[PDB]
Design a binder for these strands. Structure first.
Ligand SMILES: [Cl-]
Ligand SMILES: [Cl-]
Ligand SMILES: [Cl-]
Ligand SMILES: [Cl-]
Ligand SMILES: [Cl-]
Ligand SMILES: [Cl-]
Ligand SMILES: [Cl-]
Ligand SMILES: [K+]
Ligand SMILES: [Mg+2]
Ligand SMILES: [Mg+2]
Ligand SMILES: [Mg+2]
Ligand SMILES: [Mg+2]
Ligand SMILES: [Mg+2]
Ligand SMILES: [Mg+2]
Ligand SMILES: [Mg+2]
Ligand SMILES: [Mg+2]
Ligand SMILES: [Mg+2]
Ligand SMILES: [Mg+2]
Ligand SMILES: [Mg+2]
Ligand SMILES: [Mg+2]
Ligand SMILES: [Mg+2]
Ligand SMILES: [Mg+2]
Ligand SMILES: [Mg+2]
Ligand SMILES: [Mg+2]
Ligand SMILES: [Mg+2]
Ligand SMILES: [Mg+2]
Ligand SMILES: [Mg+2]
Ligand SMILES: [Mg+2]
Ligand SMILES: [Mg+2]
Ligand code: NA
Ligand code: NA
Ligand code: NA
Ligand code: NA
Ligand code: NA
Ligand code: NA
Ligand code: NA
Ligand code: NA
Ligand code: NA
Ligand code: NA
Ligand code: NA
Ligand code: NA
Ligand code: NA
Ligand code: NA
Ligand code: NA
Ligand code: NA
Ligand SMILES: [Sr+2]
Ligand SMILES: [Sr+2]
Ligand SMILES: [Sr+2]
Ligand SMILES: [Sr+2]
Ligand SMILES: [Sr+2]
Ligand SMILES: [Sr+2]
Ligand SMILES: [Sr+2]
Ligand SMILES: [Sr+2]
Ligand SMILES: [Sr+2]
Ligand SMILES: [Sr+2]
Ligand SMILES: [Sr+2]
Ligand SMILES: [Sr+2]
Ligand SMILES: [Sr+2]
Ligand SMILES: [Sr+2]
Ligand SMILES: [Sr+2]
Ligand SMILES: [Sr+2]
Ligand SMILES: [Sr+2]
Ligand SMILES: [Sr+2]
Ligand SMILES: [Sr+2]
Ligand SMILES: [Sr+2]
Ligand SMILES: [Sr+2]
Ligand SMILES: [Sr+2]
Ligand SMILES: [Sr+2]
Ligand SMILES: [Sr+2]
Ligand SMILES: [Sr+2]
Ligand SMILES: [Sr+2]
Lengths: 142, 172, 132, 337, 160
RNA sequence: CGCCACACGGGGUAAGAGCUGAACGCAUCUAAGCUCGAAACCCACUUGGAAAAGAGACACCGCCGAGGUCCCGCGUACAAG
RNA sequence: CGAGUGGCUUGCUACCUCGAUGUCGGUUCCCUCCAUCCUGCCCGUGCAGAAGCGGGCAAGGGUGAGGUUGUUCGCCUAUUAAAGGAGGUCGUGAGCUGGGUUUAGACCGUCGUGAGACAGGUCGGCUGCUAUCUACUGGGUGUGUAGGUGUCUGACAAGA
RNA sequence: UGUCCCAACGUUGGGCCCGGUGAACUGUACAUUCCAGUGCGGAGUCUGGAGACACCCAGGGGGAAGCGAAGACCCUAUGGA
RNA sequence: AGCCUGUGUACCAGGAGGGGAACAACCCAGAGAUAGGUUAAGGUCCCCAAGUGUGGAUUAAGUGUAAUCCUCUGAAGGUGGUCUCGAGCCCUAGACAGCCGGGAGGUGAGCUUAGAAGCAGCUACCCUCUAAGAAAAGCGUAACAGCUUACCGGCCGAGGUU
């Protein structure tokens, strides 16, 4: 519901971890960031081993709880949280001025951050956040 | 490396992105040829498969892409056909085409009919104890043929004794 | 097995002593096991009308005494429910010795038998004088 | 050797706490197939009696014979589909978009809601239809309420409100089907939705039993033999192993039992009538007398007499429908005795 | 008993028979096989089995490998084939076992082993250009019964 | 101890059965691609769930009064609450 | 003959604990592992069938009742689809039991001059505590989001 | 013959709420924890993550190697009886 | 054996501070107070100060991102997964593979045998036509038949094989 982002990043065909690392860096420097097209973000490797890892995180837990996100929405945001000292004041503040979106709720297109782009013509072993979520059982709302 | 394939006069080959479409009097076939650093394109009256890489893995796919394209050429003109013979011993096997799937009844004396959906615009024509599978896309045709044979596969009993089923008789 | 045609509240367990309603020479039978049955932890295996059971001859002629035989429960004191809702119950608990083919080993049955048991074991029925 | 044994009670109905709404809330609806139609109705539990029925089952060795069947009598008077709510699809799931209300309201609907005095039904409809053109429309549901007043045995006059989905043909068709109902006054009946012989899923808040111990609440054994005389009779062996050093939420413990929502599948509707044919002599115990619209559900229904029960076309029926079973007898014998 | 117990050279050389008694006999039946009346010079081919790691090989292992090797050469060239094979190592190292906690632990004598430095020839065969592939197979079977990995090195034999 | 109710069907896989297919003119179930395939995985079904800090959505009512508390008669509820 | 994995058996060590961390077996209740006994799906056969035998994937669910013995184990019986094995302080005595082990009484055999002993047998023989914290099962009051009523959404969570 | 299958209902006294009366055990400190790891190898406090809005009522006792007793077992002492 | 018992030495004990996730004795380092500066070990995508540094190569397993270690496993054995380097031989007088055509007569060799004719066994294993074609390498047959290998020719066209 309205987010005055100083920066709108487009995660389409972009390496999730590399984008996450730059968004964390900027958020810590005071920038308000909106990551768009999360379902289209990308992660390299064997789809079978990548999914096993995310499935293990979904299965982990107990009474204390290990709530792991399944939507590309939350997967990406958690990824960013792991690069932020979210339990510290400054860290929680940065994390809270960051938001990820399915599709692009803005009229302005996002920008592609340098070094985070994956070239589909040169790569075949990678998966999409959307694909992961579907496998995890998420409701493909996007 | 680079390989050039002169497209047949009877054929027209258009292509956008990673998808290639081939059309002829016998129909059309579209395929996605996607592999790291292998560019496929239609340079006038010739289809080109090229890459700056030449390692075994790359060469493997290049040769693979070629055959796929040459097969598309062949399928849109001459077409692809597979012949099958329905053999059975004690129980009269009823093989029929219904809708977009081939149905088999009374297999080995079973009450429940066995069936499979035909792939693509593949055509299945049955004449007595003979079946012919044909179409422009060798993928859909070859599978449909195979599926029919698999459809009468038996794991439970000794095959040397129970041989009922439909088998691929001729391969294109 | 073929549906019985009535609901049964098993009135017997492993070890129960029951009447042998026939002329095989066996007077009292002890329930050892129930055909086709499998219970749960701590649960004593139960049997009722219509069940085939393995039995041991407790009282009777020397020749029959101690033999481990198969039998069919024909009567029980615990009520059963018939399709029309009525409950049916007998004066005692009884079973009939039966062979590997479910044919009665004896020649004559003693006392009434539930119609439902008769439907299941016909040869047993074609020995009954009274079917209720 | 420590024999195996399934655990005590299911882990699928927790936490075992007091229900938030005494009015049941379906968490699933039938699939769209037939013509448009409201996918549910409601009523108040009265009690039980039994009926003799002609065996309907074509695969039963008894087909065509007398069969006594237990029946729970539910008073199902007419309800009021008072509004049409539309849901729009969004990245975060379905969300209420707008509602189209009516003018005619039951005299006592104001005991629960602040009834509309000024509303624009066409503006609402407009926005909805535009949502459909846009292709952002999620299912369509009707705001529904009961008329307790029509039921003498039930003391309440305050209506019970629940939302019920409308499924059917094309959205455009059922959207119009929905608007049709609402406008009138929303008044509809059990007939309009169900036919005797069909299978329904019944939902309701079970009878409350307050706090109960592990034995009754989870079905754990009582201590046995000598173990029953030392000072422990109805307490479980232990709360868990040395490690993990904590009590897992899976061990059977004391707590609230009863007054939980339950959705019971495939309940056969034996008969939908009106009058006092099912009433019992002396009156249903702790309830009263029935003489109005009623439904006879095969078997048991969750809840105590007077509680609101909800019906929905079975979403996972096991058997095919055998419409209008033949009822040869309906016991009216006193339930005291 | 596992060879893991003795395969390493983690103890002093213990070979002095004048100070050790009760030493079990070796299980090695022969050290010279094939036609031992003929010289190794009379053959065009000489292939050796070279150990790649320094180790100790118990006599029970020498016998098993040597046996499964010569056995093959016999089955493939005959009980008198024109070939000859040699096992050049002898198990001089006496082995113990402490078989009563760690008190007075010096073990009792239980066997013998041969110390083989990495790179050494354990076995060496001499054959004709024909039976060259048969000896290479005999060694493949032999190195499967001794601790270390081995190289099947072909010395005189430029008939590739 | 009595009575009632507790799927079918989808989707993706394992082992495995295959298709097309090259590296290696052939062959090859595999290297890219694909058709199938387990009581197992996901969905389907039930239960909880605005404290989900991005702390939610809709409709109507009200801001001199909508609604609510105390009070009173009671239980479909309940150890206090 | 050679190479390993496990940490279920036993042995070894003496690192932790002697101002005490109560034993074996059983019981009750909960979670887990797979090296799979059954159930699902497969491959091979010295696979006609039926059925065996061997192998693969697979831990969702199941794996029960009884006779001797404190027994674990095991032997035995009738059932069963099968009646698998193992980890959780050899899970579980501020939960139970007290048969066994393991005080003080007594007997037998053996040993000892004797007192007395036995890694033998045998009869009898005691089980404290009002929960501070934490953990969990259920039940409330507040604050936050930020005037009220009603209806919902569904991130997550549990299920066999 | 309810020891058991397999538990149910009931009775009296407690338990729960209210008035009055009114102790003791225990307390280095901090303390909302959970999963792993590490560490004198058996951690609420160290490390990494996960979870976690405060307070209160009832409960059965998983953990605090819970509280109670300078281990009775075993060994040692140029100890005792 | 994070075992027992020696020996030399530095360390802990009795040694801070920096690094090593934590961590007596592993690395840097021996330290009065305070202040500025430059380095050490170690590190420079984010958590966290410094590179999303440069030239180049390999890896597709999330191998790996783990100096030392009770603490970080990974073995014998196997691998036309892939990369790189070398040696021998064959090839436009056409190699390697594939496909097509030919694979013939004396004679079904002699012997053995009722029979055996490439192919039960024993012995021999010769020459015609010719561009080739065994007294026959593998199936097949009661024995024949039949199906292929060798060998030759054609089509094809560039590396192939060890
Ligand atoms: Cl969790
Ligand atoms: Cl933090
Ligand atoms: Cl790739
Ligand atoms: Cl039994
Ligand atoms: Cl007990
Ligand atoms: Cl110093
Ligand atoms: Cl990873
Ligand atoms: K101690
Ligand atoms: Mg028991
Ligand atoms: Mg009554
Ligand atoms: Mg009565
Ligand atoms: Mg010590
Ligand atoms: Mg204690
Ligand atoms: Mg396995
Ligand atoms: Mg079989
Ligand atoms: Mg499980
Ligand atoms: Mg224990
Ligand atoms: Mg305890
Ligand atoms: Mg105790
Ligand atoms: Mg106590
Ligand atoms: Mg005793
Ligand atoms: Mg005395
Ligand atoms: Mg005793
Ligand atoms: Mg002391
Ligand atoms: Mg003493
Ligand atoms: Mg003294
Ligand atoms: Mg000191
Ligand atoms: Mg930084
Ligand atoms: Mg790894
Ligand atoms: Na990655
Ligand atoms: Na999780
Ligand atoms: Na007590
Ligand atoms: Na304990
Ligand atoms: Na499936
Ligand atoms: Na399983
Ligand atoms: Na026993
Ligand atoms: Na313990
Ligand atoms: Na115990
Ligand atoms: Na005790
Ligand atoms: Na115990
Ligand atoms: Na009692
Ligand atoms: Na406790
Ligand atoms: Na020093
Ligand atoms: Na540090
Ligand atoms: Na990894
Ligand atoms: Sr940066
Ligand atoms: Sr509802
Ligand atoms: Sr729900
Ligand atoms: Sr007691
Ligand atoms: Sr613990
Ligand atoms: Sr040593
Ligand atoms: Sr070896
Ligand atoms: Sr496969
Ligand atoms: Sr809120
Ligand atoms: Sr202590
Ligand atoms: Sr496994
Ligand atoms: Sr099986
Ligand atoms: Sr034990
Ligand atoms: Sr024993
Ligand atoms: Sr146990
Ligand atoms: Sr005792
Ligand atoms: Sr004794
Ligand atoms: Sr004893
Ligand atoms: Sr605050
Ligand atoms: Sr911490
Ligand atoms: Sr208490
Ligand atoms: Sr870089
Ligand atoms: Sr580089
Ligand atoms: Sr350790
Ligand atoms: Sr290492
Ligand atoms: Sr290896």
């Amino acid at each position: 519901a309205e987010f005055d982002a100083d920066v709108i990043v487009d995660a389409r065909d972009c390496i999730m971890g590399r984008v996450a690392s730059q968004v964390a860096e900027q958020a810590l420097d005071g920038e308000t960031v909106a990551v768009v097209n999360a379902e289209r973000a990308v992660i390299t490797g064997r789809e079978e081993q990548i999914v096993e890892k995310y499935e293990k995180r979904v299965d982990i837990g107990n009474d204390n709880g290990y709530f792991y996100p399944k939507r590309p929405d939350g997967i990406f945001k958690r990824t960013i949280r792991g690069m932020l000292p979210h339990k510290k004041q400054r860290g929680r503040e940065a994390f809270e001025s960051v938001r990820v979106y399915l599709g692009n709720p803005y009229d302005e297109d996002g920008e592609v951050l340098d070094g985070t782009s994956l070239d589909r013509l040169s790569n075949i072993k990678f998966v999409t956040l959307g694909e992961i979520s579907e496998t995890l059982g998420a409701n493909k709302t996007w | 490396p680079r390989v050039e394939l002169e497209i047949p006069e009877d054929v027209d080959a258009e292509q956008d992105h990673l998808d290639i479409t081939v059309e002829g009097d016998n129909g059309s076939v579209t395929r996605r040829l996607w592999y790291p650093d292998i560019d496929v394109s239609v340079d006038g009256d010739t289809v080109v498969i090229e890459s700056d890489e030449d390692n075994a893995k790359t060469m493997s796919t290049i040769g693979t892409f070629q055959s796929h394209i040459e097969n598309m050429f062949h399928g849109v003109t001459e077409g692809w056909e597979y012949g099958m013979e329905v053999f059975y011993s004690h129980f009269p096997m009823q093989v029929n085409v219904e809708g977009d799937e081939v149905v088999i009844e009374n297999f080995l004396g079973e009450k429940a009919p066995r069936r499979t959906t035909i792939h693509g615009d593949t055509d299945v024509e049955i004449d007595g104890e003979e079946l012919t599978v044909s179409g422009p896309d060798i993928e859909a045709v070859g599978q449909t043929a195979a599926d029919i044979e698999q459809l009468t596969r038996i794991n439970d009993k000794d095959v040397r004794v129970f041989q009922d089923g439909v088998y691929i008789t001729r391969k294109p | 097995m073929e549906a019985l045609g009535a609901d049964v509240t098993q009135g017997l367990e492993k070890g129960s002593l029951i009447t042998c309603a026939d002329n095989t020479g066996a007077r009292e039978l002890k329930v050892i096991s129930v055909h086709g049955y499998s219970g749960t932890k701590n649960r004593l295996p139960k049997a009722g009308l219509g069940d085939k059971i393995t039995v041991s001859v407790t009282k009777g002629t020397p020749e029959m005494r101690r033999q481990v035989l198969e039998a069919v429960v024909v009567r029980q004191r615990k009520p059963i429910r018939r399709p029309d809702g009525t409950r049916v119950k007998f004066e005692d608990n009884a079973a009939v010795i039966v062979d590997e083919n479910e044919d009665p080993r004896g020649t004559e049955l003693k006392g009434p038998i539930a119609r439902e048991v008769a439907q299941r074991f016909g040869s047993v029925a074609s020995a009954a004088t009274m079917i209720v | 050797p420590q024999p195996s044994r399934p655990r005590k009670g299911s882990l699928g109905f927790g936490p075992r706490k007091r229900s938030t709404s005494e009015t049941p809330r379906f968490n699933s609806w039938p699939s769209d197939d037939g013509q448009p139609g409201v996918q549910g109705f409601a009523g108040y539990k009265a009690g039980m009696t039994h009926v003799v029925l002609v065996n309907d089952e074509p695969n039963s060795p008894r087909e065509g014979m007398e069969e006594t069947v237990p029946v729970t009598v539910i008073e199902t008077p007419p309800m009021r589909a008072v509004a049409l709510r539309a849901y729009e699809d969004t990245p975060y799931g379905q969300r209420p978009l707008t509602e189209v209300w009516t003018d005619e309201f039951h005299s006592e609907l104001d005991r629960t809601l602040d009834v509309p005095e000024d509303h624009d039904p066409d503006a609402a409809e407009e926005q909805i239809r535009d949502a459909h053109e846009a292709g952002d429309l999620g299912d369509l549901r009707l705001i529904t309420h009961t008329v307790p007043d029509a039921v003498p045995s039930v003391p309440k006059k305050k209506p019970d409100v629940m939302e019920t989905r409308v499924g059917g043909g094309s959205v455009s068709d059922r959207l119009d089907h929905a608007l049709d109902i609402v406008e009138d006054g929303g008044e509809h009946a059990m007939n309009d939705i169900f036919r005797a012989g069909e299978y329904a899923d019944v939902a309701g808040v079970t009878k409350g039993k307050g706090t109960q111990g592990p034995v009754k609440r989870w079905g754990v054994q009582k201590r046995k033999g000598k173990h029953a005389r030392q000072g422990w009779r109805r307490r479980i062996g232990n709360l868990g192993p040395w490690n993990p050093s904590r009590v897992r939420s899976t061990v059977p413990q004391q707590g609230q039992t009863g007054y939980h929502q339950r959705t019971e599948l495939n309940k056969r509707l034996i008969d939908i009538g009106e009058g006092d044919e099912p009433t019992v002599d002396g009156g249903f115990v702790n309830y009263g007398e029935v003489d109005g619209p009623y439904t006879l559900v095969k078997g048991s229904v969750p809840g105590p007499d007077k509680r609101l029960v909800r019906f929905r076309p079975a979403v996972r029926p096991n058997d095919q429908p055998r419409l209008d079973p033949e009822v040869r007898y309906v016991s009216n014998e006193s339930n005291q005795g | 008993k596992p060879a893991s117990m003795y395969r390493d050279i983690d103890k002093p050389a213990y070979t002095r028979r004048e100070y050790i008694t009760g030493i079990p006999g070796s299980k090695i039946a022969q050290h010279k096989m094939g036609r031992k009346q003929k010289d190794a010079d009379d053959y065009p081919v000489q292939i050796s089995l070279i150990v790649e790691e320094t180790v100790q090989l118990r006599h029970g292992s020498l016998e098993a490998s040597r046996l499964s090797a010569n056995r093959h050469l016999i089955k493939e060239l005959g009980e008198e084939g024109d070939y000859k094979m040699t096992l050049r190592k002898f198990p001089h190292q006496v082995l113990r076992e402490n078989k009563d906690g760690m008190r007075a632990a010096f073990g009792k004598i239980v066997g013998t082993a041969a110390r083989v430095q990495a790179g050494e020839q354990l076995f060496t065969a001499y054959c004709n250009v024909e039976d060259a592939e048969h000896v290479k197979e005999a060694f493949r079977r032999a190195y499967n019964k001794i601790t270390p990995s081995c190289r099947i090195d072909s010395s005189p034999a430029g008939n590739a």
